[PDB]
């Protein structure tokens, strides 16, 4: 009846105005079986990682144009400490294994009031590469404080700026005009999503199961799911009201598994 | 299999490290991975099994490039303690290796063979 | 009818909900995914080998390296360049200047109806000649292997090794056609239409899968090395998915507005 | 596991013998001798007779 | 029949000459109940910490006198990385809690042969303070490379050099002559122990349950159990034989529990 | 008889095992732990209060601080100094020079038979006078509290506050004795004979328990502040464990060889 409270481990979250919980593809997204591509003893969930982890995004401002977006690669967020996120036990255990698989639960929060106008779209895009710079290297924490909100242009629309394999000098460089990771703004509502606007609610909750091309993926590189936020109607408010609303989100892993124990990972 | 004098005594450490950025280089690192302790005694041989831990069913049998589907880590042997020998015995014993398929080993998808051996 | 679109789930209705009327009959089921994709189509055009070949080197290749280009074709809907998997489709809008021109390919229909994320299916291949009264053959090897490059001497006549091997080789009569089907042989369970992972643990290129294809194909003339002709020849390759399946929705290309 | 290789006969094991784990499924049987050798291949090249 | 193999998790240990396993006080030292002094949800064992951790001690030499000893505080060994020990997952989880309780299993290894003479005593002394310098501060890793083997003297015999509370200057400093933590060498065989000598065996295994003055103890300071090695008969061997034997040990925790989750500990 | 002592466990035998003979009868059971420890003994000797007191400050106390020393006695077998728990027993072998001399105590018999690690028991207290025909009283407060220090004015006669309170206070007639029993009231479940932990999370002194005692005791003269006499007085304290228990073996002191 618009009041709900979600509990897990030693943490609990509530809301004074809810719209429901969206289950992605199945009746019970939590149910899952151990992987069949490894024969060692796996490591199921323990009570110290059944939690909600919270972080902070950049603030929404009226100067933002339409279809500008922000992205958050789920398994990569912990590893890169984006937006101040820190997993503690989950991060420590993820840094000490070779393989990992798990679903997710996410929720976003905003604090608009009845005197504001605007709308935000929140969706979970699978198998995306919005977190990588055109040169092919992951964005540093300094770049986010400059590109507050990612712009939208024909390059993103057509996937013409994807990661690039240098072709050497024996050939002659061609003209690149299309790629498989394009983004089509008008069709983003295909993925599991909820629409957030000033007049109706202040939070959105989505539940998602595991997906991958193999039963399990490498810990340090898998990027199957990604969180997306996009602007549909630019913000506007009467002069004198509260400005620059804040945004926050929380995440929870479900039915994890691990395999291939080893020492702390180190790049080389 | 240990083929040294019957009077010797010692211990060895065997470890298997899944893939990482850099391979192990010390006992402290080796202890954390999968490993076992083998001690010289009456019986001479000791068997070790490399578990099949892979991100996908089936794996390639040749490594054109070190994708995760071809290379699968390293195996290393560590001398836990030095060997003890009585006076008037030869030094530097030797150890021997054997390799074989497991119980649940399987192959698939034949391919043409390389004739370079004739040269 | 009153409803809330913010909930994400909206129940489809009919004319009778708010007005007087009735629902229409089913009709036909031509939208079935299995029935839609079982149709042959052109994929690529390649030359015909007349001697032992040298497989192209990896992409960081500098100038001056000797190899054979445009003789091998990959079997995969994804973009490719220089007989190796790629990530961005290419196009030469100014055919001039030095440098070798890179072969390219794509499956226009498949990516025009690529509404999902993962795919799996068998595949049937066919080849056709583009020259009058030509004799040729076609060879194939599975995903994750390589082409043997050498020859043998019989009666002082060199014979390339690709004549023989325990992986299929087929011959056609004057003006004939070659046809056969292949299984799904990649190590991965499904083929990713779009990907965002990395294969190697470091120095990898994100979004470039390693084994998203069925195999590799090439054509050659059944004659010894001593009969290298003076004119190039070409053939055309046709593929046809069989018993297809899909697994997760996605979005379609962006049709630009003039 | 302790064993003696000098006896010639050694019993094949699995991952579970010395660690926690389980055995894998069979898979396919492409190694069968009868199925392996039924494939054509080149043997020799010869000339054509035009007289006795 | 003198051949045994101990298995746990993804690790296994063996021995060609065993004498048995000593159980400290009960029939099954592993059985244990959760603590009754906290009401939050505890964290039981998970498959990634059921292991044996191995380390290296300093080498035995003929110049060592009688009753010289070496000590290893169990829960403190992981925290101080003594002898190259590193717990990985266990250490990471121990650094992120307030309370902890668990038993132990230990084993030591040596490689003497039939042509050597000597004996070593291995015992588990409960509630000891042999790991602290006279000034009251924990010994640094540099001190161990100088004091290879701890000497024995009247000070240790009488506990006359225990940690000291400075008494100020208002009083007049007295003469200290006795303390409750004395060590009596001739009675060390009271504690659970096994005797290691050249002619009989090369390993000793002891099993020990949990003990404490409260159901649970603080993670960063509890020191209930301690491992002890002492010399009974000084080493001797004929000229030309192997010199300076090595020593090693391995540890395993059993039936752990944790409470009071928080972030990484930091001194201040 | 042949045996192996390295195994740690050795089975006790009798005379008949290797020779002709027989076993002896039981006898008596005076070694029972409960029966052994139920005997009173001297613990400490303290002075008698004649006014409001000032509890001694913590140990880092510098010079010039004003307080009262030697008026309070702890109830615990462990060593103590200056009415506060300690770790090392003290002894003044040269009573000379400046500085205040620190009171000390210990339970010689208890530590001579302290063969275990943990202990728990009730405790019965008694007091006795060391002066002819003295009138006095005894007060007590539980572990983990403090002594109130102030006075009140009745009819222009100051009366210390320790006269009143809801924690036991007892009076004795001319030449009488005071006796009563106390429960086990510390927060810890058992009293550690020897300890190796730390109480505070940092800057602590290892091996110094915080609440290993039963309480605290003192004696005072029931007269107003206006009758502070000219001569000091002393009393003696006796304790007696009751219904004791032990939990884990240990070793005994080191009897030095001349």
End-to-end gap of chain A: 54 Å
Q: Which structural class matches the secondary elements of chain A? A: mainly beta
Given helix and strand content, the structural type of chain B is mainly beta
Termini of chain B, distance in Å?
A: 35 Å
Strand content of chain B: 15-25%
The CATH class of chain A, by name, is: Mainly Beta
Apparent shape of chain A: globular
Total tally of structural domains of chain A: 1
The strand count of chain A comes to 13
- Written as H for each helix and E for each strand, in order along the chain, the element string of chain B is EHEEE
| Main beta sheet of chain B | 3 strands, antiparallel
Region (Interaction with host receptor ANTXR1) (chains A, E): 155-176
Protein name (chains A, E): Capsid protein VP2
Subunit structure (chains A, E): Interacts with host entry receptor ANTRX1.
Subcellular location (chains A, E): Virion; Host cytoplasm
Description:
The structure is cut from a larger assembly and holds 2 copies of chain A (268 residues), 1 copy of chain B (119 residues) and 3 copies of chain C. Chain A has one domain (1-268): Jelly Rolls (Sandwich). Chain A is built from 4 helices and 13 strands. Chain A has helices at 74-80, 89-94, 141-144, 154-158, and strands spanning 4-8, 11-15, 21-23, 53-56, 69-73, 99-109, 116-126, 175-178, 193-197, 203-208, 217-218, 225-237, 248-259. In chain A, strands 3, 4, 6, 10, 11 and 13 form a 6-stranded mixed sheet that branches. Helices cover 5% and strands 18% of the residues of chain B. Chain B is mostly beta strands and 119 residues long. The two termini of chain B are 35 Å apart. Chain C is mainly beta and 258 residues long. The two termini of chain C are 36 Å apart. At the A-C interface, strand 8, strand 9 and strand 11 of A face strand 5 and strand 13 of C. Strand 8 of chain E pairs antiparallel with strand 5 of chain F.
Task: Detail the topology: elements first, then pairings.
This is part of a larger assembly, with 2 copies of chain A (268 residues), 1 copy of chain B (119 residues) and 3 copies of chain C.
Chain A: E1 4-8, E2 11-15, E3 21-23, E4 53-56, E5 69-73, H1 74-80, H2 89-94, E6 99-109, E7 116-126, H3 141-144, H4 154-158, E8 175-178, E9 193-197, E10 203-208, E11 217-218, E12 225-237, E13 248-259
Parallel strand pairs in A: 3-10
Antiparallel strand pairs in A: 1-2, 4-13, 5-12, 6-10, 6-11, 6-13, 7-9, 7-12
Chain B: E1 11-17, H1 27-32, E2 34-39, E3 45-46, E4 74-79
Antiparallel strand pairs in B: 1-2, 1-4
Chain C: H1 33-36, E1 41-47, E2 73-74, E3 80-81, E4 84-85, E5 89-91, E6 104-105, H2 108-112, E7 118-129, E8 137-142, E9 151-154, E10 157-160, E11 169-171, E12 178-182, E13 191-192, E14 215-220, E15 234-246
Antiparallel strand pairs in C: 1-15, 2-14, 3-4, 3-6, 7-12, 7-13, 7-15, 8-11, 8-14, 9-10
PDB class: virus
Keywords: SVV, Virus, Non-enterovirus, capsid uncoating, Senecavirus, Oncolytic virus
Entry title: Seneca valley virus Altered particle at acidic condition (A-particle[C])
């Amino acid at each position: 009846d618009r009041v709900t409270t979600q509990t897990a481990g030693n943490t609990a979250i509530n809301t004074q105005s809810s719209l429901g919980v969206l289950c992605a593809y199945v009746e019970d997204p939590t149910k899952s079986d151990p992987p069949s591509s490894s024969t060692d003893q796996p490591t199921t969930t323990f009570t110290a990682i059944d939690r909600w982890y919270t972080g902070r995004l950049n603030s929404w401002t009226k100067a933002v144009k339409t279809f500008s977006f922000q992205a958050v690669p789920l398994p990569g967020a912990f590893l890169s400490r984006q937006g101040g996120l820190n997993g503690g036990a989950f991060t420590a255990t993820l840094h000490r294994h070779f393989l990992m698989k798990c679903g997710w639960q996410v929720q976003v929060q905003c604090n608009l009031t009845q005197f504001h106008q605007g709308a935000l779209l929140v969706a979970m895009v699978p198998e995306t590469t919005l977190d990588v710079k055109p040169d092919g290297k992951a964005k540093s924490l300094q770049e986010l404080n400059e590109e507050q909100w990612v712009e939208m242009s024909d390059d993103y629309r057509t996937g013409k700026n994807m990661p690039f394999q240098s072709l050497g000098t024996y050939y002659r460089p061609p003209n690149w005009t299309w790629g498989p990771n394009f983004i089509n703004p008008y069709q983003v509502t295909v993925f599991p999503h909820q629409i957030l606007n000033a007049r109706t609610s202040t939070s959105v909750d989505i539940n998602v199961p595991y997906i991958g091309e193999t039963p399990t993926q490498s810990s340090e590189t898998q990027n199957s799911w990604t969180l997306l936020v996009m602007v549909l109607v630019p913000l506007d408010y009467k002069e004198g009201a509260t400005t620059d609303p804040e945004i926050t989100f929380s995440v929870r892993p479900t039915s994890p598994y691990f395999n291939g124990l080893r020492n702390r990972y180190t790049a080389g | 299999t240990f083929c040294g004098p019957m009077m010797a005594r010692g211990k060895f450490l065997l470890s298997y490290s899944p893939p990482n950025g850099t391979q192990p280089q010390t006992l402290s690192e080796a202890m954390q991975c999968t490993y076992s302790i083998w001690d010289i005694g009456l019986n001479s041989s000791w068997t070790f099994v490399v578990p099949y831990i892979s991100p996908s069913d089936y794996r390639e049998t040749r490594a054109i490039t070190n994708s995760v589907y071809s290379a699968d880590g390293w195996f290393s042997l560590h001398k836990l303690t030095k060997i003890t020998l009585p006076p008037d015995c030869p030094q530097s014993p030797c150890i021997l290796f054997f390799a074989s398929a497991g119980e649940d080993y399987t192959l698939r998808l034949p391919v043409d063979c390389n004739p370079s051996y004739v040269f | 009818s009153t409803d809330n679109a913010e909930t994400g789930v909206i129940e489809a209705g009919n004319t009778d909900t708010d007005f007087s009327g009735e629902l229409a009959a089913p009709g036909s089921n031509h939208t079935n995914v299995k029935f839609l994709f079982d149709r042959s189509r052109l994929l690529n055009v390649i030359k015909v080998l007349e001697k032992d070949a040298v497989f192209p080197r990896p992409f960081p290749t500098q100038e001056g390296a000797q190899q054979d280009d445009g003789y091998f074709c990959l079997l995969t809907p994804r973009p490719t360049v220089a007989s190796r998997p790629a990530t961005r489709f290419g196009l030469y809008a100014n055919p001039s200047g030095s440098g070798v021109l890179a072969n390219t390919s794509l499956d226009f229909n498949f990516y025009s109806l690529a509404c999902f994320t993962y795919f799996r299916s068998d595949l049937e291949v066919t080849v056709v000649s583009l020259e009058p009264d030509l004799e040729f053959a076609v060879g194939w090897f599975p995903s994750g292997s390589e082409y043997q490059a050498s020859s043998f001497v019989y009666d002082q006549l060199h014979v390339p090794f690709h004549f023989t091997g325990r992986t299929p080789r087929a011959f056609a009569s004057k003006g004939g056609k070659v046809s056969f089907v292949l299984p799904w042989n990649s190590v991965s369970s499904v083929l990713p239409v779009r990907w965002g992972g990395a294969s190697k643990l470091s120095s990898a290129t994100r979004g470039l899968p390693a084994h998203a294809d069925w195999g590799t194909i090439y054509a050659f003339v059944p004659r010894p090395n001593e009969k290298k002709s003076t004119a190039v020849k070409h053939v055309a390759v046709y593929i046809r998915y069989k018993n297809a399946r899909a697994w997760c929705p996605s979005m379609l290309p962006f049709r630009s507005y003039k």
